[PDB]
Amino acid sequence: GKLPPGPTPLPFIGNYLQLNTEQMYNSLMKISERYGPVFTIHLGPRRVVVLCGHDAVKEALVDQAEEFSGRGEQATFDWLFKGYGVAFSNGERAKQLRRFSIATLRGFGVGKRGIEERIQEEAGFLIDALRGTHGANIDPTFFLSRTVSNVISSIVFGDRFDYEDKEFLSLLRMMLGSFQFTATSTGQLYEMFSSVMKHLPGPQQQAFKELQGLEDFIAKKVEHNQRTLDPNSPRDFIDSFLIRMQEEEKNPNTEFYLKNLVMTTLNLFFAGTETVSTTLRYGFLLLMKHPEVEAKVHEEIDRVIGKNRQPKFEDRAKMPYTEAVIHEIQRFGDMLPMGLAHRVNKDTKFRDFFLPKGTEVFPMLGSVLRDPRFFSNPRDFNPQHFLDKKGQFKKSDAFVPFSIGKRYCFGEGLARMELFLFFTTIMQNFRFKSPQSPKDIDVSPKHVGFATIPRNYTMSFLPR
Ligand code: HEM
Ligand SMILES: CN(CCCC(=O)c1cccnc1)N=O
Ligand SMILES: CN(CCCC(=O)c1cccnc1)N=O
Incomplete structure (x- = not known):
């Protein structure tokens, strides 16, 4: 029993005096x-091992992938998930749900021509919506989030939502509120002191109501899908999971049952909406602070693609500049600064330390995205980070916004495709005007915590 070094804690409050909840x-x-x-x-009362920089994160999550593949505690969310659903499970439950969620999303077109076509189909509606604003200043938040969510929604529920569906708007607010809550100083305090804070009035109460709202919605959709299920022709992720529950009814230790379906579906709908939406939203702000970057992306779209032909995922090979920009937006944006909490699944020897079974591990993915050994200017927006001196795309080992190892984001293929398609389709059609000159735009985060949330802004979409 020999732990990594760290500051001496106080009882209950832990290292609270050394941990500024705001940053x-x-x-x-x-x-x-x-x-x-x-x-x-x-x-607070929870002992956690923390990993800082590329080497430390990579050594744990890759070199000792199997030991570090456990999912740790996450207080904002555990009261609801309780260890069910793909993202919040451990051991055997995690392996099954993950393997199925992957096979099933591939079956609806993820990573192939079919999802590409669904993204192109959905981007089309966003185009219509943005033209329909006639260059007025709009908060792009829900314009983007409607469009992003409709891709995953198609897959998981069988059909897109109408942009004017008021229940759809509601759900989006639920995702937005609860996501941002983990970035706030109150979200951080909550992670420390949930056993007290859960019973207190505060922004946490609204996050709970939203997470509950999202759950009740998925529950209601699952009930509807049960009542009308055709077991040889699945319309969606829910049906396929239902079909698989039928087939596993004889196995009293199956992971395939209603709680795991509700929670996994919640995970996909939420994970499939908020991160890509937020990444787009941050990227636009970054591109209006850097019009010379927007301009070069424009000339690359104009040259490889056209003013009208719709982007396909193949175009990216011939567009190293746009690709560098997008990656640089993910690296700069640092959406999930701690990823998701990990834990060791067995007694583990790590460097000269011993981590007993169950020890919580926070991989600081943000410390990797800003690791100075990998980035010439870790603290600036600089697409040159993803370019060689020939102007070709250059990959980095420190590019970890989807995490790494056994628990890595299996939405990665889908996210990359959405980011490329949506950036390129939107920018084909419009240039971005801020009601502010580039130098007064603040690209520093509104809240940074378990998520990075860009500042509120508005903007004009001016047609080309
Ligand atoms: C820009 C977009 C995204 C980013 C930055 C991102 C990042 C991440 C990170 C850092 C993790 C934690 C992995 C770990 O435990 O170490 C994660 C997990 C996960 N993500 Fe994403 N993700 C994105 C998009 C998506 C999408 C679109 C989906 C929907 C398919 C998705 C589904 C999941 C799921 C189900 C997990 C849990 C996997 C597991 O527990 O084994 N993500 N993501
Ligand atoms: C409420 N939510 C919590 C975790 C979502 C998650 O793991 C995630 C978020 C963004 C990207 N990938 C995964 N899941 O339902
Ligand atoms: C907002 N983000 C959640 C971050 C995961 C989280 O709450 C957490 C808690 C403790 C340590 N690391 C991550 N995912 O949607």
């Missing part, structure tokens, strides 16, 4: 610099 990333970088790249923290 947790800075606090943890300060502690790493003091104690070393691998260190122990007390997040």
Whole structure:
């Protein structure tokens, strides 16, 4: 029993005095610099091992992939999921749900021509919607989120929602509110002190109501799908999972049952909406602070693609600049700064430390995206980070916004395709005008915590 070094905690409050709830990333970088790249923290009463920089994250999550593939505690969410659903499960449950969720999303077209066509189909509606604003200043938040969510929604529910469906707008707010809550100083405090904070009035109460709203909605859709299920012709992710529950009814230890379906579906609908939506939203702001970057992306679209032919995922090979920009938006944007919490599944020897079974591990993916050894200017927006001196696309080992190892984001293929298609389709059609000159636009985050949330803004879409 020999743990990574770390600051001496106080009872219950843990390392609270050294952890500034407003910028947790800075606090943890300060502690790493003091104690070393691998260190122990007390997040309220919870003992956690933290990993800082590429080497430390990669050594754990890759070199010891099997030991570090457990899912740790996440207080904003555990009260609801309770260890069910793909994203929140462990061991055997995680393997089954993951394997099926992957096979099933491939079956509806993910990673092939079919999802490409669904994204092109949905982008079309966004085009119509944005033209329909006639260059007025709009908050792009829900314009983007409607379109993004409709891709995953098609797959998981069988049909897109209408843009004017008021229940659809509601659900989107639920996702937006609860996602942002994990970025706030209150979200951070909650992670430390949930056993008290759950019973107190506060922004946490609204996050709970939204997460509950999302669950009740998925439950209601699953009930409807049961009542009308055709077991030889599945219309969606829900049907396929239902069909698989039928087939596993004889196995009293199956992971395939209603709770795991509701929770996994919740995971896909939520994960499939908010991250891509937020990445787009941050990217637009970044591109209006950098019109010379927007311009070069424009000339690349104009040259490889055209003013009208709709982007296909193949075009990216011939567009290293746009690809560098997109990746740079993901690296700069640092959507999930701690990823999702991990834990060791067995007693584990890591460097010269011993991590007993169940030890919680926070991979600092943000410390990797901003690791100075991999990025010439880690703290600037610089597409040159993903370009060689020939102007060709250059991959980086520190490019980890989807995490790495056994639990890596299996939405990765889908996200990359959406980001490329949606950036390129939108920018084909419109240039972005800010009601502010490039130099007064603040690209620093509104909230940084378990998510990175861009500042509110408005913008004009001006047609080409
Ligand atoms: C820009 C978009 C996205 C980013 C930045 C992102 C990032 C991440 C990260 C950092 C994790 C944690 C993996 C770990 O435990 O280490 C994760 C997990 C996960 N993501 Fe995403 N993701 C994105 C899009 C999506 C999409 C579109 C889906 C829907 C298919 C999705 C579904 C999932 C699921 C189901 C997990 C849990 C996997 C598991 O527990 O084994 N993600 N994602
Ligand atoms: C409420 N939500 C919590 C976790 C979602 C998640 O794991 C995620 C989010 C963005 C990208 N990939 C995964 N899941 O339903
Ligand atoms: C917003 N984000 C959730 C971040 C996961 C989280 O809540 C957490 C908690 C403790 C340590 N690491 C991540 N996913 O949608």
